[PDB]
Design an enzyme around this catalytic site. Sequence first.
Site, PDB file in Angstrom:
ATOM      1  N   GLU A   1      -8.687   0.841   9.512  1.00 40.47           N
ATOM      2  CA  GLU A   1      -9.094   0.757   8.107  1.00 40.47           C
ATOM      3  C   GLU A   1      -9.028  -0.717   7.669  1.00 40.47           C
ATOM      4  O   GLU A   1      -9.952  -1.220   7.042  1.00 40.47           O
ATOM      5  CB  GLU A   1      -8.240   1.683   7.205  1.00 40.47           C
ATOM      6  CG  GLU A   1      -9.004   2.159   5.973  1.00 40.47           C
ATOM      7  CD  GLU A   1      -9.211   1.122   4.889  1.00 40.47           C
ATOM      8  OE1 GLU A   1      -8.264   0.343   4.595  1.00 40.47           O
ATOM      9  OE2 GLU A   1     -10.318   1.133   4.287  1.00 40.47           O
TER      10      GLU A   1
ATOM     11  N   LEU B   1       0.838  -1.184   0.000  1.00 41.96           N
ATOM     12  CA  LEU B   1       0.000   0.000   0.000  1.00 41.96           C
ATOM     13  C   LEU B   1       0.887   1.253   0.000  1.00 41.96           C
ATOM     14  O   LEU B   1       2.046   1.224   0.412  1.00 41.96           O
ATOM     15  CB  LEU B   1      -0.945   0.011   1.199  1.00 41.96           C
ATOM     16  CG  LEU B   1      -1.835  -1.232   1.252  1.00 41.96           C
ATOM     17  CD1 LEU B   1      -2.600  -1.213   2.548  1.00 41.96           C
ATOM     18  CD2 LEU B   1      -2.740  -1.323   0.067  1.00 41.96           C
TER      19      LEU B   1
HETATM   20  N1  LIG Z   1      -5.594   0.192  -1.686  1.00 43.74           N
HETATM   21  C1  LIG Z   1      -6.307  -0.879  -1.995  1.00 43.74           C
HETATM   22  O1  LIG Z   1      -7.610  -0.949  -1.703  1.00 43.74           O
HETATM   23  C2  LIG Z   1      -5.734  -2.068  -2.637  1.00 43.74           C
HETATM   24  C3  LIG Z   1      -4.413  -2.064  -2.979  1.00 43.74           C
HETATM   25  N2  LIG Z   1      -3.827  -3.060  -3.667  1.00 43.74           N
HETATM   26  C4  LIG Z   1      -2.458  -2.824  -4.198  1.00 43.74           C
HETATM   27  O2  LIG Z   1      -2.427  -2.829  -5.617  1.00 43.74           O
HETATM   28  C5  LIG Z   1      -1.310  -3.526  -6.131  1.00 43.74           C
HETATM   29  C6  LIG Z   1      -1.845  -4.772  -6.857  1.00 43.74           C
HETATM   30  O3  LIG Z   1      -2.811  -4.484  -7.857  1.00 43.74           O
HETATM   31  P1  LIG Z   1      -2.490  -4.615  -9.452  1.00 43.74           P
HETATM   32  O4  LIG Z   1      -1.079  -4.251  -9.714  1.00 43.74           O
HETATM   33  O5  LIG Z   1      -3.631  -3.891 -10.045  1.00 43.74           O
HETATM   34  O6  LIG Z   1      -2.619  -6.199  -9.704  1.00 43.74           O
HETATM   35  P2  LIG Z   1      -3.725  -7.345  -9.530  1.00 43.74           P
HETATM   36  O7  LIG Z   1      -3.933  -7.753  -8.139  1.00 43.74           O
HETATM   37  O8  LIG Z   1      -4.937  -6.987 -10.302  1.00 43.74           O
HETATM   38  O9  LIG Z   1      -2.896  -8.512 -10.206  1.00 43.74           O
HETATM   39  C7  LIG Z   1      -2.607  -8.511 -11.597  1.00 43.74           C
HETATM   40  C8  LIG Z   1      -2.613  -9.958 -12.086  1.00 43.74           C
HETATM   41  O10 LIG Z   1      -3.824 -10.588 -11.709  1.00 43.74           O
HETATM   42  C9  LIG Z   1      -4.328 -11.370 -12.768  1.00 43.74           C
HETATM   43  N3  LIG Z   1      -5.567 -10.750 -13.222  1.00 43.74           N
HETATM   44  C10 LIG Z   1      -6.024  -9.495 -12.895  1.00 43.74           C
HETATM   45  N4  LIG Z   1      -7.246  -9.330 -13.445  1.00 43.74           N
HETATM   46  C11 LIG Z   1      -7.586 -10.471 -14.083  1.00 43.74           C
HETATM   47  C12 LIG Z   1      -8.707 -10.868 -14.796  1.00 43.74           C
HETATM   48  N5  LIG Z   1      -9.769 -10.064 -14.839  1.00 43.74           N
HETATM   49  N6  LIG Z   1      -8.742 -12.129 -15.312  1.00 43.74           N
HETATM   50  C13 LIG Z   1      -7.682 -13.002 -15.155  1.00 43.74           C
HETATM   51  N7  LIG Z   1      -6.553 -12.623 -14.463  1.00 43.74           N
HETATM   52  C14 LIG Z   1      -6.534 -11.380 -13.936  1.00 43.74           C
HETATM   53  C15 LIG Z   1      -3.239 -11.455 -13.799  1.00 43.74           C
HETATM   54  O11 LIG Z   1      -2.419 -12.555 -13.426  1.00 43.74           O
HETATM   55  P3  LIG Z   1      -1.555 -13.395 -14.500  1.00 43.74           P
HETATM   56  O12 LIG Z   1      -0.430 -12.504 -14.938  1.00 43.74           O
HETATM   57  O13 LIG Z   1      -1.050 -14.575 -13.719  1.00 43.74           O
HETATM   58  O14 LIG Z   1      -2.494 -13.706 -15.601  1.00 43.74           O
HETATM   59  C16 LIG Z   1      -2.577 -10.111 -13.602  1.00 43.74           C
HETATM   60  O15 LIG Z   1      -1.277 -10.031 -14.131  1.00 43.74           O
HETATM   61  C17 LIG Z   1      -0.427  -3.789  -4.907  1.00 43.74           C
HETATM   62  O16 LIG Z   1       0.453  -2.675  -4.740  1.00 43.74           O
HETATM   63  C18 LIG Z   1      -1.439  -3.861  -3.770  1.00 43.74           C
HETATM   64  O17 LIG Z   1      -0.795  -3.622  -2.538  1.00 43.74           O
HETATM   65  C19 LIG Z   1      -4.555  -4.118  -4.109  1.00 43.74           C
HETATM   66  C20 LIG Z   1      -5.915  -4.175  -3.918  1.00 43.74           C
HETATM   67  C21 LIG Z   1      -6.657  -3.099  -3.210  1.00 43.74           C
HETATM   68  N1  LIG Z   2     -10.878  -0.548   2.369  1.00 44.83           N
HETATM   69  C1  LIG Z   2      -9.855  -1.260   1.950  1.00 44.83           C
HETATM   70  N2  LIG Z   2      -8.629  -1.145   2.579  1.00 44.83           N
HETATM   71  C2  LIG Z   2      -7.544  -1.882   2.179  1.00 44.83           C
HETATM   72  O1  LIG Z   2      -6.480  -1.795   2.832  1.00 44.83           O
HETATM   73  C3  LIG Z   2      -7.721  -2.749   1.106  1.00 44.83           C
HETATM   74  N3  LIG Z   2      -6.666  -3.497   0.654  1.00 44.83           N
HETATM   75  C4  LIG Z   2      -6.889  -4.348  -0.403  1.00 44.83           C
HETATM   76  C5  LIG Z   2      -5.909  -5.446  -0.735  1.00 44.83           C
HETATM   77  N4  LIG Z   2      -4.838  -5.550   0.236  1.00 44.83           N
HETATM   78  C6  LIG Z   2      -4.953  -6.252   1.381  1.00 44.83           C
HETATM   79  C7  LIG Z   2      -3.823  -6.425   2.180  1.00 44.83           C
HETATM   80  C8  LIG Z   2      -3.900  -7.131   3.380  1.00 44.83           C
HETATM   81  C9  LIG Z   2      -5.119  -7.640   3.813  1.00 44.83           C
HETATM   82  C10 LIG Z   2      -5.234  -8.399   5.105  1.00 44.83           C
HETATM   83  O2  LIG Z   2      -4.126  -9.110   5.607  1.00 44.83           O
HETATM   84  N5  LIG Z   2      -6.403  -8.395   5.735  1.00 44.83           N
HETATM   85  C11 LIG Z   2      -6.658  -9.274   6.872  1.00 44.83           C
HETATM   86  C12 LIG Z   2      -6.198  -8.650   8.193  1.00 44.83           C
HETATM   87  C13 LIG Z   2      -7.081  -7.467   8.584  1.00 44.83           C
HETATM   88  C14 LIG Z   2      -6.615  -6.744   9.836  1.00 44.83           C
HETATM   89  O3  LIG Z   2      -5.407  -6.580  10.069  1.00 44.83           O
HETATM   90  O4  LIG Z   2      -7.432  -6.270  10.651  1.00 44.83           O
HETATM   91  C15 LIG Z   2      -8.096  -9.673   6.921  1.00 44.83           C
HETATM   92  O5  LIG Z   2      -8.415 -10.613   7.700  1.00 44.83           O
HETATM   93  O6  LIG Z   2      -8.940  -9.078   6.176  1.00 44.83           O
HETATM   94  C16 LIG Z   2      -6.248  -7.463   3.024  1.00 44.83           C
HETATM   95  C17 LIG Z   2      -6.168  -6.775   1.819  1.00 44.83           C
HETATM   96  C18 LIG Z   2      -8.159  -4.421  -0.992  1.00 44.83           C
HETATM   97  N6  LIG Z   2      -9.203  -3.658  -0.569  1.00 44.83           N
HETATM   98  C19 LIG Z   2      -8.972  -2.834   0.481  1.00 44.83           C
HETATM   99  N7  LIG Z   2     -10.020  -2.085   0.881  1.00 44.83           N
END
Ligand SMILES: NC(=O)C1=CN([C@@H]2O[C@H](COP(=O)(O)OP(=O)(O)OC[C@H]3O[C@@H](n4cnc5c(N)ncnc54)[C@H](OP(=O)(O)O)[C@@H]3O)[C@@H](O)[C@H]2O)C=CC1
Ligand SMILES: Nc1nc(=O)c2nc(CNc3ccc(C(=O)N[C@@H](CCC(=O)O)C(=O)O)cc3)cnc2[nH]1
Length: 185
Positions: free
Chosen positions: A30, A22
Amino acid sequence: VGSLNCIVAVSQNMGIGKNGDLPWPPLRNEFRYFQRMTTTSSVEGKQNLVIMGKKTWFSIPEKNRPLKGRINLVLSRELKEPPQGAHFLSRSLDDALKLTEQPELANKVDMVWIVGGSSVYKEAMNHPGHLKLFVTRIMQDFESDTFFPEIDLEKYKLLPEYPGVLSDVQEEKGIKYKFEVYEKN
Ligand SMILES: NC(=O)C1=CN([C@@H]2O[C@H](COP(=O)(O)OP(=O)(O)OC[C@H]3O[C@@H](n4cnc5c(N)ncnc54)[C@H](OP(=O)(O)O)[C@@H]3O)[C@@H](O)[C@H]2O)C=CC1
Ligand SMILES: Nc1nc(=O)c2nc(CNc3ccc(C(=O)N[C@@H](CCC(=O)O)C(=O)O)cc3)cnc2[nH]1
Ligand SMILES: [K+]
């Protein structure tokens, strides 16, 4: 599946990720909100399903994988089988939703939550029919390499409140944020 939920936390510059983690320091309440929203199901005998991309899966600390109390499904076009600890693997979002109606998951899944990353969100948000977006607005800029788009208010409405979601600005570790809920029909 008649409804999908997306959940995300975004910075002011629309960032969601940096270097496989993140962009911001850990915000424990959060994270607990994420856990509560994705885990909570009052339908006896069922669990919620979380759908995520491969990079998102590996971004979760190994000790917290799979996410407890939820069915964990990873999307990949290259794997194979699910990564170690994950319950299911699908090649597309459409394939994942289809899987929930087959015998193994038929009477097992309650809510479906999309938990990232960027591609998975983009497609889910264009999916026909009912969608809710649970968006945490982190009210600071953070250097990021992965982004979430601006939400189009033509398609989505910002709900003024939602049961069980706090409305006021939150603060942890000196960082302010707020919980939003958007919906389309
Ligand atoms: N702030 C937040 O709420 C969240 C933050 N994060 C952050 O975002 C980053 C990761 O996200 P991002 O880089 O977008 O990558 P993703 O988690 O979306 O992973 C990308 C890989 O997932 C697979 N993939 C994704 N979409 C599809 C699909 N629709 N169908 C089939 N395969 C799929 C592919 O794998 P393959 O190459 O094997 O085909 C692709 O290369 C990290 O830095 C993480 O910490 C992640 C989620 C939420
Ligand atoms: N609202 C929101 N906040 C996020 O941080 C977030 N992160 C992602 C993807 N990243 C992550 C990274 C770690 C964990 C995780 O270890 N969660 C555990 C522990 C929660 C806690 O520490 O309280 C879980 O049980 O959900 C989940 C998502 C996707 N949607 C989000 N959505
Ligand atoms: K339940």
